[PDB]
From a paper:
Recently, we have successfully expanded the scope of available synthetic metal complexes for heme substitution in the heme acquisition system protein A (HasAp)16–21 which is a hemophore secreted by Pseudomonas aeruginosa under iron-deficient conditions. Herein, we report a heme-substituted protein dimer composed of the native hemoprotein HasA, which accommodates a tetraphenylporphyrin bearing an additional metal coordination site. Herein we report the dimerization of HasApf5 derived from Pseudomonas protegens PF-5,34 by incorporating Fe-TPP with a phenanthroline (phen) ligand as an additional metal coordination site.
Size-exclusion chromatography (SEC) analysis of HasApf5 bound to Fe-TPP showed a single sharp peak under both alkaline and neutral conditions (pH 7.0–9.5), whereas Fe-TPP bound to HasAp gave a single sharp peak only under alkaline conditions. The UV-vis spectra of HasApf5 bound to Fe-TPP recorded after several days were almost identical to the initial spectra even under neutral conditions, suggesting that the Fe-TPP binding is highly stable. Its overall structure is similar to that of HasAp with Fe-TPP (root-mean-square deviation [RMSD] over amino acid residues 2–180 for Cα atoms: 0.397), and Fe-TPP is positioned in the heme-binding site with coordination by His32 and Tyr75. Upon closer examination and comparison, additional hydrogen bonds mediated by water molecules were observed at the Fe-TPP binding site: namely, Glu36-water-Arg33, Lys124-water-Ser79 and -Asn80. These additional hydrogen-bonding interactions appear to contribute to the stabilization of the Fe-TPP binding. The result of docking simulations of Fe- TPP-phen into HasApf5 using the crystal structure of the Fe-TPP-binding form indicated that the phen ligand is anchored away from the HasApf5 surface, suggesting that the formation of HasApf5 assemblies would be possible through the addition of metal ions.
Author numbering: 1 to 180
């Protein structure tokens, strides 16, 4: 199952890289680092949690921007390698207005773009250098480049003419992307 993309018609003429760069700037950097972790401000959360789930989700400390990662995710906390998110990410959904997550699934009230069949997978022993950790931490720290790089590779695996510099409408014509 190759990467599949859903997008709001709004973004049809945007490139995937343009959308990711803009969304990351709107979201900002939650500053989840030693000495700066503020529960309920920059922790986000898991479903079901508390440290593991089929989803991890977080909203901006300032804007309405949010994302949801779907897969099977595990946070090591103090277990070596400490502060590592690992497991699998199948889907990343970007947009604004995070809802749910505590007895029900996290969802975006305004889902803008969703990338599924991502096939992201990393073991605990890879630590913070694992592709799951890099991709998801980048999205909450103001750097969408790890996710853009992974999407670029997945698109080129469908056809070398496709890239993150393709527009959503281009990927729609190629059968990879679909409106809504």
């Amino acid at each position: 199952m190759s990467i599949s993309i859903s997008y709001s018609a709004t973004y049809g003429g945007n490139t995937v890289a343009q959308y990711l760069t803009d969304w990351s700037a709107y979201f900002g950097d939650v500053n989840h680092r030693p000495g700066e972790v503020v529960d309920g401000t920059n922790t986000g959360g898991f479903n079901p949690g508390p440290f593991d789930g089929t989803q991890y989700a977080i909203k901006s400390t300032a804007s309405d921007a949010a994302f949801v990662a779907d897969g099977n995710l595990h946070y090591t906390l103090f277990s070596n390698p400490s502060h590592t998110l690992w497991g699998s990410v199948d889907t990343i959904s970007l947009g604004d207005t995070l809802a749910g997550g505590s007895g029900s699934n996290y969802n975006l009230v305004s889902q803008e773009v969703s990338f599924t069949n991502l096939g992201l997978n990393s073991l605990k022993e890879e630590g913070r250098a694992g592709e799951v950790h890099k991709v998801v931490y980048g999205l909450m720290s103001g750097d969408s480049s790890a996710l853009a790089g992974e999407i670029d590779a997945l698109l080129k695996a469908i056809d070398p003419s496709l890239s993150v510099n393709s527009t959503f409408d281009d990927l729609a014509a190629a059968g990879v992307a679909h409106v809504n």
